[PDB]
Every structure is written in structure tokens, then in C-alpha cells.
Design a protein around this ligand. Structure first.
Ligand SMILES: [Cl-]
Length: 300
């Protein structure tokens, strides 16, 4: 479908323009071509951000096939640089040693290819104890073992994200059908304790109210420090105008003026905490897949 990709690029360019980002065809088009065979059956969403990432729109294609190595695919098509850094060998170790059943890719309309995601099934989640054995894992995973076990999340890794551009990795917890992160992680006492322990900014009232609604968390780690760099809470909802946040103008426009109607999850909103403050993210769902409802929680 020549004109399926052309139509998709058009959606991408218009959506970027709603959040005041100029899309680069030279970055996007090679990627759409490289993954053309897995786009129709993927879940596609478009994510805007506040803070420094406000200069790009992330395009996410998830729930791609089990047999796909999306990093290998990107490398073969020249979309991401060949590297000797362990970031470039981690995905293969993850897929071999954790029960990974699907994957995903992220690219910026201006930045190009940036991340992969590796998804276990809700029936069999990943473990920090599996991750620490891998030759390419960040030291920070083992360094933070006590944190993961304290909060009861060490055996419920629901996604592994790898950012090739930043050389970081995200570990996600929650979000699967029948799965739960422990309740106390979302209550004010816990939110304060977690951000305190991790040396992150104290939670704003906005974050505290937002956390009440959350059932997914993720931590970002790097290879160059033992410290968790950020801790993010996410909320799924069809009614993002009802979230207890002061929405950025670009976010209001993406909600009201996207060139499509949202599907499935509709929206996934995130508030990231770093050592220096907080920033917000919102993902608007363009293409959903019904078969994913068996694996992922999708009402909000
Ligand atoms: Cl499959």
C-alpha cells in the first residue's frame, strides 16, 4: 500500500503541526518504509511533551510481532547508528532471556528512530532478577534491587524500553490485564517516599492528584550512573480534559484538534519526575487493535 504510507505520513505531519513541530520527511519516510510490513497490525499513538521534549512529536508503533527484532531492522535500514556501547546489544539479550511476546518502536518526527520496547505477556511478566544477569544491562538495575523489592515490583516488569539516542533504559510496571502495582505506590505517602529515596523533586499537588488515578509506573536508568534518573506515573483515560492538571496549550490542541478520532486506550498521560522538576507527556491513540484488549488494560 503505497498510499497507506503516504496517508500515514500526512496524519503524522498534521499531528506534529498541531503541537507546533515541523515533521521531517527525511527522518520519517525511511522508517515508515523500513517497518511497512508491521504497521497495519500495530497500535499507533502520537506523544507530545512539555519541557525540553516539546520540540518533537514521538510516533509509537507497538504490539509488533514476536519474531521481529526491531533494532536489527533499524540497523539494517540505516535508521540508527552502529555502536559498541551495550545499549546496542541489550535488546537481543532481553528477547532471549525474558518471556518477550511482542515489541514496539518509537521515533521523533524531527529526531528519527530513538527507542524500542520489548513486551512480556501479562501471563508471564519479566523479573529484575532475570535482567541483572544480562551482559548488557545497566549496573543501575542491580544497584536498585532493594528499591524494586521494597515496593514489591521486582517480579512484575511489564515492558523494557531502550532509548538508543539517550543511552537509557526504562523499566515499566503495571498495565496488563489482571495485574496490579501495589496500592501504596499511588498514595501520597508512597509517592513522597519513592521520590525522596530516588533523590527526585518532591511531588507537586498536581502530581499527587494525578497519581491517584495511575496504575502504571516506570523508572529510567542509564549506564553511566547507579541512580534512577526519573520516575514516571501514567494514567489512561478517554477524558484527558478531566485530569487534575493544568494542561499545556499544545496538549489541549492535540486533544481537540488532532486530524483523527482516538481509539482504544484513547489517551495515556504521564508525569515524569527528575532531580530538577517534573514534565508532562500525553499520547493520543490513532490506531488500536482489538486483539490487544486480551493483554492490556484499556478502559480509563
Ligand atoms: Cl505474533
Amino acid at each position: 500500500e503505497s498510499a497507506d504510507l503516504t496517508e500515514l505520513y500526512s496524519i503524522i505531519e498534521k499531528t506534529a503541526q498541531v503541537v507546533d513541530v515541523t515533521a521531517s520527511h527525511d527522518k520519517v519516510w525511511p522508517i515508515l518504509n523500513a517497518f511497512q510490513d508491521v504497521i497495519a497490525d500495530s497500535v499507533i499513538s502520537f506523544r507530545a511533551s512539555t519541557g525540553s521534549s516539546a520540540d518533537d512529536l514521538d510516533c509509537r508503533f507497538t504490539m509488533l510481532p514476536k519474531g521481529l527484532d526491531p533494532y536489527a531492522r533499524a540497523l539494517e535500514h540505516g535508521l540508527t547508528p552502529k555502536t559498541d556501547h551495550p545499549v546496542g546489544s541489550l535488546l537481543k539479550e532481553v528477547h532471549e532471556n525474558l518471556p518477550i511476546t511482542s515489541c514496539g518502536v518509537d521515533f521523533g518526527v524531527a529526531g528519527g528512530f530513538t527507542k524500542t520496547w520489548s513486551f512480556p505477556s501479562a501471563e508471564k511478566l519479566g523479573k529484575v532478577s532475570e535482567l541483572v544477569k544480562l551482559p548488557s544491562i545497566p549496573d543501575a538495575v542491580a544497584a536498585n534491587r532493594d528499591f524494586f523489592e521494597k515496593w514489591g515490583i521486582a517480579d512484575m516488569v511489564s515492558t523494557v524500553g531502550i532509548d538508543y539516542s539517550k543511552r537509557t533504559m526504562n523499566l515499566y510496571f503495571g498495565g496488563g490485564v489482571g495485574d496490579r502495582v501495589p496500592a501504596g505506590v499511588f498514595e501520597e505517602k508512597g509517592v513522597r517516599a519513592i521520590l525522596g529515596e530516588l533523590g527526585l523533586a518532591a511531588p507537586s499537588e498536581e502530581l499527587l492528584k494525578f497519581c491517584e488515578r495511575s496504575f502504571v509506573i516506570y523508572v529510567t536508568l542509564s549506564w553511566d550512573s547507579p541512580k534512577i534518573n526519573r520516575f514516571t506515573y501514567s494514567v489512561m483515560t478517554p477524558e484527558p480534559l478531566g485530569l487534575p492538571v493544568d494542561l499545556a496549550p499544545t496538549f489541549e490542541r492535540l486533544i481537540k484538534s488532532a486530524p483523527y478520532d482516538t481509539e482504544g486506550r484513547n489517551y495515556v498521560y504521564g508525569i515524569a519526575s527528575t532531580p530538577k522538576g517534573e514534565y508532562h507527556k500525553i499520547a493520543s491513540y490513532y490506531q488500536w487493535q482489538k486483539r490487544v484488549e486480551k493483554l492490556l488494560r484499556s478502559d480509563g
